[PDB]
Design a protein around this ligand. Sequence first.
Ligand SMILES: Nc1ncnc2c1ncn2[C@@H]1O[C@H](COP(=O)(O)OP(=O)(O)O)[C@@H](O)[C@H]1O
Lengths: 423, 477, 469, 464, 56
Amino acid sequence: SDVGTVIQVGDGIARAHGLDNVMSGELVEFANGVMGMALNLEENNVGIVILGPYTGIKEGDEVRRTGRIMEVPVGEALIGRVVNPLGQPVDGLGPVETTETRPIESPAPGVMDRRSVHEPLQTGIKAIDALVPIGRGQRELIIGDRQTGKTSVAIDTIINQKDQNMISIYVAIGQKESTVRTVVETLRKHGALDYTIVVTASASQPAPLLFLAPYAGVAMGEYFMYKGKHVLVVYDDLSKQAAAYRELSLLLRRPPGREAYPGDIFYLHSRLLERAADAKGGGLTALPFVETQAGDISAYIPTNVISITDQIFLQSDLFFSGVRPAINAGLSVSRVAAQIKAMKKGARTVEVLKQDLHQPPVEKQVLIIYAFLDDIPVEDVRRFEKEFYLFLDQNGQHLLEHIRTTKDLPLNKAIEAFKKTFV
Amino acid sequence: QVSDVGTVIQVGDGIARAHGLDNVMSGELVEFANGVMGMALNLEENNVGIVILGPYTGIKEGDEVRRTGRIMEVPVGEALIGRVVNPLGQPVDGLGPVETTETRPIESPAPGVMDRRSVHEPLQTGIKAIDALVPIGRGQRELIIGDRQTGKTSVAIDTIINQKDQNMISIYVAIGQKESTVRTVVETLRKHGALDYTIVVTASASQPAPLLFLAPYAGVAMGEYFMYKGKHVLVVYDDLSKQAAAYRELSLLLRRPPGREAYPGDIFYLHSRLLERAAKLSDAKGGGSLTALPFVETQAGDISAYIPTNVISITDGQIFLQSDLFFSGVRPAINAGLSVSRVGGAAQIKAMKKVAGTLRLDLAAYRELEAFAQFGSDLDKATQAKLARGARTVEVLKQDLHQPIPVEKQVLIIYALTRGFLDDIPVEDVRRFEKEFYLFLDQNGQHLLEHIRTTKDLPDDLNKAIEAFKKTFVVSQ
Amino acid sequence: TRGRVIQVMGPVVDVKFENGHLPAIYNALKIQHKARNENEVDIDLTLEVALHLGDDTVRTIAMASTDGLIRGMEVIDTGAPISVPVGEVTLGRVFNVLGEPIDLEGDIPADARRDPIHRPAPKFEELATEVEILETGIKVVDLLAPYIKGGKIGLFGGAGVGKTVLIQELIHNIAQEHGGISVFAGVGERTREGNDLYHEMKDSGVISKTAMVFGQMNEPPGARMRVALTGLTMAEYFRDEQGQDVLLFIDNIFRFTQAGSEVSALLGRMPSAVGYQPTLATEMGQLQERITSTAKGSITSIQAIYVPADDYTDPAPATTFSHLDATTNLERKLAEMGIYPAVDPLASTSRALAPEIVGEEHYQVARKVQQTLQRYKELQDIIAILGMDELSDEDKLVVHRARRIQFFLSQNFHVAEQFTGQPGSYVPVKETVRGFKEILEGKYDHLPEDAFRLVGRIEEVVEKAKAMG
Amino acid sequence: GRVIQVMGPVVDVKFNGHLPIYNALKIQHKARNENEVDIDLTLEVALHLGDDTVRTIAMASTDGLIRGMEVIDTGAPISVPVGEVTLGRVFNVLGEPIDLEGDIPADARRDPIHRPAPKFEELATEVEILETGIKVVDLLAPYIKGGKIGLFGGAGVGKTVLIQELIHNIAQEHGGISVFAGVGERTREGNDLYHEMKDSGVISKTAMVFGQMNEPPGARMRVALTGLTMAEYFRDEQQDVLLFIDNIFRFTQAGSEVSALLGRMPSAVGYQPTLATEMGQLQERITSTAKGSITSIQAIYVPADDYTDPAPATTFSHLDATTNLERKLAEMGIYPAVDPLASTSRALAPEIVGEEHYQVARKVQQTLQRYKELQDIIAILGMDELSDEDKLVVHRARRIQFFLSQNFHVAEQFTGQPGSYVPVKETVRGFKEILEGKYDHLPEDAFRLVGRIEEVVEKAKAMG
Amino acid sequence: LLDAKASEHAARMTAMKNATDNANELIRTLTLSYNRARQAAITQEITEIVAGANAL
Ligand SMILES: Nc1ncnc2c1ncn2[C@@H]1O[C@H](COP(=O)(O)OP(=O)(O)O)[C@@H](O)[C@H]1O
């Protein structure tokens, strides 16, 4: 048999009789058309976590099996589309014609299924691509208080993915739907949807969704990864996940631990990030977000995700003060061999580290990080960049090709540098 | 009939779960076969949680429980005035029963948005500190919060005692308070003659929680009468911190899911729906008033404590009484800094409105300044001048006990120092100055203080200015 | 479609219904009864479905008092969550959480449309794309803290800072130049306050254009928790039906979240950080997201955030702030000096202030006018030291210019005309940019202080230079 | 059995008289249709719920299971292949080779991962200090052969790297049988370490046991037992052993994950009411006896940098030497960031480390504390109002707190500095001179990130 | 002297500002750690009071 009957309805949590054949972690279905997961399997009932509106579910409504354990639509058809954690399209672009499906809860590549990181993921954001590199298949935690530029970072990183081969997946958890939009057209202007998947879990949405949203993203991502392709994923606030899960968790009356968060609040994030990582086709980078209250890194959730990730810190003051990005070079760090050979090898350096949002390449980049500057006063410094940049795109257009092709810079530019200056 | 009564399953801790009573209203009085009253709170499927109001020992299982069909109402009338009764209205003062015709239900809705008129008509506390800095109008709600042994009671008392010439019919609700004190207090009222307008509702610390819980509402009820008539009432709930606690006990006993600090989820609703019942009725309703004086006892003075916070946000401002001030021998122990009256100023009369405006200033700076004297060995600037009358105002703000002050000759002393007519006199002599400056007026300015009465104004400014000298120029030193 | 009362636990009431038909979660349950005998007392009450306990039994939370209930009473199911009047009926009117007018102007006819207070937020495809700034015609605002069309602004403070007027003026300037209605939602409104507020809008006359809702304090945790929704609903109408930009004021949105944890207990919820309902973020997220600019209309909300004990980390505010696009910080200081509005020029912030949004022009001058302030502010210490003489002339220019600037942030409020007589001002950002840029060029340094203090367009300051004779 | 209740990682398998505690139930089922998925799972009997029922703790995802399935009692706890075959292999929680090189012989001895701790007669007493080449440790908190070392540290404090530097400085040159079990730790580390083991030349003499962040609670629950049983072999069946347990915290942590579902009354912080005892039964087992010696070094994560947390707190009373890592010292740039006044060892005795090494030891700590107290003044009044005597103490202290920094070979690839192993005699001496004031002229920065004291003088002149 | 003293008082006038100002920041650094410890505490107390009720 399959079909069950609702017994108790409330707070995203519903339990029901029957469903004798239901598997643990099987996405069931209710009569009103809402999807749900089967979390708890008791002798006389089935714990079911409603994924979606629970108002349309009453006592007695029918709940049918699926026989599929917690999956979500995968394929190419997703690129450039905006769908919820259920893959189901919200951008009103019509349904997603997909073929293959991937399960939400998957084991991560085993020790033997992994290779050390070599290939750099260029963010194009100078401060990062210089001071804190991120190699493809790494996990770099981008942590900072509310309104420090976390959002922008991930976004400038996405436009900058047009050159290399990278499929970006921006999963907005607990973020304002309004934010999501304005964020999703900036990707349109700059033409990122061609390579990117966007999964939105608005703050209006129920806990279960936000809880799932960060996983539905990695699922969709592993596809291309497991295929040899390279993927990039953005969680904006793993904090509202830990929180969303905490809600659900407490609604279930699961006994609370420290800071109210369930004992497994670590596992929640660990088994997620511990997913991203040539006998397999050499195939996913993770850029987690954690919002801290008053710059407290010592926080529970924040320290946790640190003990996982391979992180960057955005100061609160150093933004409003006038530094974009607000990177905190000291407290920031990158564990993983990524740089370009060109990168590997004081008041004016800051003005250079300052980059304009929404305007991302390493080539003319490693040059400005070289220059041949100190003679020019601060203000016109950052200013200098724009110029000395143009001039190189014309004259040193041949000097760049040496940087790119060889990723190394083994005298010439040393002079080139007296080509654009002495002018 | 068969339903309308029930049988006691469980007894203990003032609580009784009975069977039957299939018709009890939530909040219906239920009598026990032993005569002891109670109240139905939890109406569940298989039973009903009752809170025994009175001795719960004379209650065992199986005892019958028969309904009443009344929602917890209480005696009301022009005969309680002068009588000491419990939250049930049962006279405990031991002089006869209370003969009253009418009655009113404890639980009652508050005057509607429209029903009221912005408070303008004051309440003269007779306390310089209060009705100058933290003014209280009729229909208002002024929470006086403070740590035990700060004078909270004293205030309320002297306030009441100040209600004789004013038209105010006073009601002192004692919750959790020692029946010892409540007696010595109801008496000192006896002596000052407060009983002629003053009602006393007591539930001591020996009485069961449910009585404490009921005492406040039982109080407003008796007040509400004179209000809906057009008369003016002043209710002093002495210590809501205890009543609110008594509810916690009672509610926890009914095994109600406990909240932050164990207080039930409706603990806020409790006080809110209570305090609102005090207001100023619109002229459309006879323009009555019921002014409420909620007490909050504070531990260590933690204003951040759960209950004390709720009531703070509920009232129209509060009066915070310093714990240390009180010992240092400054009575009342008011803290002008945190003490604020939001409805303020429409409550004050013009004659105060003026001489009060600057009062806050002089006292303000002095609070932010006089942290420094011992280091002021170098006393510098004119910052010495701010202190000057500052330390002097404090003297003027210090008042006796059991000795209220009429506004008339009050505005004058709050005038003197604020104009400098005091400043030439050292603090040593400030208190014992205002003392005869009153008599000096009660004989020679008895004409001047009149204009102050009949007009509530001083446009005065000229005469008094010279008329004040008439005194200092005869005073001792 | 009827049911009966099983258990009444204070503000919590259980109903249950006889098989089949169970009312959906959030559906409005009416209990009208009735006095059959003299042992009962007439009942008018309403309830909201919360949890289906089972055994054909629902747990509802009463929006009113449960004194007088008795097990067995028949609970009528309305078949829909709490509908409330929406339209030209609401304007100049005062309602409660239910939508019942609490004023004396008669009641709402059964004609009038009614909409359910619960409802999902607009579809990802509905609400707009370009970030456009809603013009307040108030200088300090439009310049140093711009409002984003269909966004949320934190209004901090509110003892004698004239916060009422600032709201009143706002309802006015919108309904005039933007032709759009306001809906004020007093959530846990203190009744003395709720009364003044109403009257004040009767004298100011800003009421003709606004809908008043009162969830007053003495109301039960249910009532207080859903008031915001009622006001919001009434607002959404004019957004989607008449495609306007409407104002939604919520005086103290903390009362809401506070009611939130307050209700959460009753339903037996295991507490979360600081005894806050675990469902807090969610309950807040659903309240805000329903506030925005659709492809048709927009809804701007001004919520007075009264932060919990001076702690900006408390999950209650901390939650709110994530929904904030702006802040108008009122301070008693600037009031004592005679600068109204009392909006602090360096504190009151905004997300709209950005070149990307307001272009360099606005951002430049605006970011500058702030700089010249944080200069004049710090020199307060050195001025009591080296005095106004030779304190470094690159500073004395600042001190001079700065004074006029913080003075030219004070404006004429129409609402103020009642007792002042000056008709009041409306200055576009455009106008407000010039007046500042020019002053920042010093083109005015030759004019007296008491010029730019309470005026309109820079040109008015100038005419204020004819002392006549 | 027949599974009638599935709760997350906690499964309720129903069984007359069959009633299998600590035993392993395997659920071997095959997809009967297309609405099912193949299940290969092993449950560990936890408790007897009565009515002929038992509550079990899974060792992997319980997804796909259904009520009414068939459970088999292997009739014994989790048995793991032990022996001279375990060397140069990577096992699971169950003792399965995950290294993709063959499997294990049926003849091979399979021990249970649950044993009683050695009696009072067994465990040893004797004391022997052990050189690590780490200036801080050796001086302030020296390690002991056959003794238990804790490494306490919060997130991103350098626990891992410190371990690496130990295995580097010790495991390589010991001659001992190494057993490294990463518990709940990183997945990258496993590959970083496994493939560096091959470079170095010990992946012979080391036993690799893993479970990491992606495995459910039940897993991490026993990976610390599985690896222990491994070392327990070479100790009780044959030599001295170095047991490297990475984050013993993850054991207790995973513990709380299950404790809820067991239907247990939560303890302080919501931890399992058995937290203490559960760790007692897995510690004493990691000990040296009269048969064989076990020198273990365990990484101890500090949740939210709170040393008062039941996990590491309760752990303290389990070690002969500790190294407590501080985030402050870390941001100072002091690495390893090791509390010079918190870290301890039972070795600090004149009756153990000698007088000379002792007195300096405290002398350093003394002057470090005296600087600690002074800090509030400095933070308020600067150094201006300090005595000409307290100032000196501020200089020494600092330079001593800086010389306590070290170059870890497992660093270089980042910073670019090579590395150093500072002999104990040279650490002892180096600090002497500093306390004795031969260096009061050299600037601080000179003493930062170095080896033997001579280097400081070298890096000194390089400054100018 | 006069110019020496003039300095003294001044240098002290300031050094006693630097301390005041700094001390004032010590508040912020603590206010923060007080709130945080104000939170975790009110959270632990409650969790304790409920977890002791569910036990009944
Ligand atoms: N001895 C050291 N020298 C230089 N850098 C170090 C040292 N120890 C740690 N670090 C830096 O600190 C960070 C934390 O490293 P790790 O050992 O992984 O911390 P944990 O294992 O405690 O989370 C690393 O990114 C590393 O760059």
